[PDB]
Design a protein around this ligand. Structure first.
Ligand SMILES: NC(=O)c1ccc[n+]([C@@H]2O[C@H](COP(=O)([O-])OP(=O)(O)OC[C@H]3O[C@@H](n4cnc5c(N)ncnc54)[C@H](OP(=O)(O)O)[C@@H]3O)[C@@H](O)[C@H]2O)c1
Ligand SMILES: NC(=O)c1ccc[n+]([C@@H]2O[C@H](COP(=O)([O-])OP(=O)(O)OC[C@H]3O[C@@H](n4cnc5c(N)ncnc54)[C@H](OP(=O)(O)O)[C@@H]3O)[C@@H](O)[C@H]2O)c1
Ligand SMILES: O=C(O)C/C=C/c1cccc(C(=O)O)c1C(=O)O
Ligand code: NA
Ligand code: NA
Lengths: 359, 357
């Protein structure tokens, strides 16, 4: 069996990493929980066993086969290469390595083939991107993809435990204490690192991550660049608007595409239904469509409201929902680990290709 | 001065109609409040004055100069033609008369000219449509509009007072009693008239109004058809996805357009800023953009996140927010009543064009 390390075990994603590993087929002989100085020393369960949380360091990875990183870009940047040097295979949840040509950016249903040539780090795409890829890959396979326009409806848990607590606190102030939404004090949303913070309670915030110099946010640009890389096709035009709404868990997306060939809607429904990881929830006569609240807890990605555009011959609209901490993060990661095991790819990389940041 | 009736004074829109009328320049000699049998006899303020609510009937409209209807399609269908017969000019917030070619469908900043030839009923468009017209008309004026793709983020007040209360109750159950959202009981959303009801707390429901034969909802199709009539151009391609989110007041819209000619973004910003009823809130260096919670209570429509498509030469994306009960409903209506007064159009109509029911 394997020695598995979860880096960022104590946060929003980490708690789901733990659940997904508890429910995994991976043969696990030993679990180790890593976090920051703040949590180092506390205790947390794996199944019935108590595990002591360790501060993440350059030397914490000795004897580790697999490490799942969900502790923020800076932490992956700093310690993931030292894990690779020590012999680990890393599955990284953060943005840091996603656009690195030496790193497979993987959604196992779509591009598991990219895993074979790994160099010790496999990157998880962004949650919003992952569910979109699960919905669209079956379509792309049969009728091609010319362009995508997407407006997202993103849950606060995407911004971490702190953002969940902040959201809940704000809603309680308004609903129980009669505070006006515009009078609320926010500390984290829309983005913990940006300069100004706004309330999410009864609001919709058209900012996720920070602004880039083209006036799209990094979240929007991630959807653009990550799609191109995952589908191995720079020609696919992708523009996004990424919006936070008062939902704790599960992202929703209004997705527009234009195919290369005309894709009959009833065949699109069938192809999506037949694709692993994607579930068709689309029966308007009984008001059946994906909903954030029903997606929570499921590893599947749900697709519905599938219909042709009223004007564009090759245009198609749909609604895609998935739990952003499961398929959007922890399940994708564990599923990559499982796929690595299946393909005999859990073993040390001889040649280090990633900059060591701590000398 | 005028005698003004508010039909549906007791509901979510009615309450704002009262507010907008209280704050209006319209010379009002007499105010009357009309609702259902079950509100008749109740008292409701107009400023400091106590007004007794009356039941809406076929003969309630004698002496009325202006009637603002926001009592539901069925109520406008039944009584509006009788109001017109009594010599009223009706401003209707409902969908019932919107696609009647004898009925102007008006956003006063966009197509005030359409008021002049009215036959006693003016229709206010759908809330989601109105804010989009305010944002896009100044762009259309300078560079044309070829197509629109919009995804909405719509407040629950759009489905009425009952929906607001249901949403508040749901949220309280999850936050205070630890109910899982998927175990909540619902009775109104997504649509009161449809067969099945679903929770909106911590949800996003991709259904507003009922489904039509083509698998778009009536809300989505109203956005398409109303745009074409307002802008007087059936060639504008319009497709919508309308989604309810857990916000009580103010609709937000992610809008994508393709113009006929390329529109420099700084000029697009300037045009919108200069358009009456539209306010530019767009300074991403300081994270300035429209926000539902900031829009609540304002008559203005706020526009931001304005940017070129990454690939389509003539493509532009933006974010448009407005209070759905003000510009989306009660303010658009009062503003039509004010424009009618300005233009000397508050007078009986000779020709009866609407069948008595
Ligand atoms: N695939 C996706 O789309 C997706 C979705 C969500 C998140 N993510 C990624 O996962 C990261 C964490 O997300 P989250 O929502 O779980 O955040 P979170 O709830 O804020 O938790 C942050 C976690 O990182 C740990 N951490 C912070 N600084 C550290 C350091 N210097 N060394 C070691 N550990 C450190 C924290 O440990 P302490 O308890 O000790 O602070 C905690 O376990 C995000 O920053 C993002 O990069 C990806
Ligand atoms: N009296 C009651 O117990 C009662 C029962 C049901 C609904 N309502 C109204 O509706 C609200 C409940 O939620 P909602 O979402 O349904 O309201 P809403 O959409 O916010 O407003 C509905 C409006 O249409 C009016 N209306 C309904 N039937 C009518 C008729 N036959 N003739 C003239 N006007 C009519 C209502 O007046 P009415 O107040 O006369 O209904 C109300 O002003 C209440 O706040 C109240 O305004 C009242
Ligand atoms: O906000 C969301 O819905 C998803 C958040 C993702 C996220 C948040 C903070 C940092 C990062 C990051 O690693 O840069 C990321 C990410 O792209 O995975
Ligand atoms: Na499937
Ligand atoms: Na094998």
């Amino acid at each position: 069996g394997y020695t598995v390390a979860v880096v960022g075990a104590t946060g929003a994603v980490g708690a789901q990493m733990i659940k997904m590993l508890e429910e995994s087929t991976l043969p696990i002989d030993k679990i180790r929980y890593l976090a920051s100085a703040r949590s180092a020393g506390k205790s947390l369960k794996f199944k019935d066993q108590d595990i002591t949380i360790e501060e993440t360091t350059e030397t914490a990875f000795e004897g580790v086969d697999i490490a799942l990183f969900s502790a923020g870009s800076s932490t992956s940047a700093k310690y993931a290469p030292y894990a690779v040097k020590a012999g680990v295979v890393v599955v990284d949840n953060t943005s840091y390595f996603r656009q690195n040509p030496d790193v497979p950016l993987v959604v196992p249903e779509v591009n598991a083939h990219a895993l074979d040539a790994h160099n010790g780090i496999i990157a998880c795409p962004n949650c919003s991107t992952i569910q979109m890829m699960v919905a669209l890959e079956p379509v792309r396979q049969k009728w091609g993809l010319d362009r995508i326009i997407v407006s997202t409806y993103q849950a606060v848990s995407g911004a971490g435990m702190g953002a969940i607590l902040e959201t809940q606190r704000e809603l309680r102030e308004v609903l129980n204490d009669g505070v006006k939404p515009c009078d609320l004090h926010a500390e984290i949303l829309p983005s913990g690192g940006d300069k100004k913070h706004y309330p999410i309670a009864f609001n919709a915030l058209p900012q996720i991550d920070v602004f880039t110099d083209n006036d799209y946010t990094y979240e929007e640009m991630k959807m653009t660049k990550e799609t191109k890389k995952i589908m191995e096709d720079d020609s696919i035009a992708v523009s996004a608007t990424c919006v936070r709404i008062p939902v704790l868990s599960a992202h929703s997306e209004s997705v527009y595409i234009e195919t290369k060939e005309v894709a009959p809607i009833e065949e699109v429904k069938a192809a999506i239904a037949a694709f692993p990881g994607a579930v068709l929830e689309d029966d308007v006569a009984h008001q059946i469509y994906p909903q954030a609240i029903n997606a929570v807890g499921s590893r599947d990605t749900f697709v519905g409201r599938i219909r042709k555009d009223l004007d564009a011959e090759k245009g198609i609209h749909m609604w895609v929902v998935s739990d952003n901490l499961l398929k959007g993060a922890a399940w994708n990661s564990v599923q990559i680990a499982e796929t690595l095991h299946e393909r005999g790819l859990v073993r040390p990389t001889a040649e280090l290709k990633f900059e060591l940041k701590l000398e």
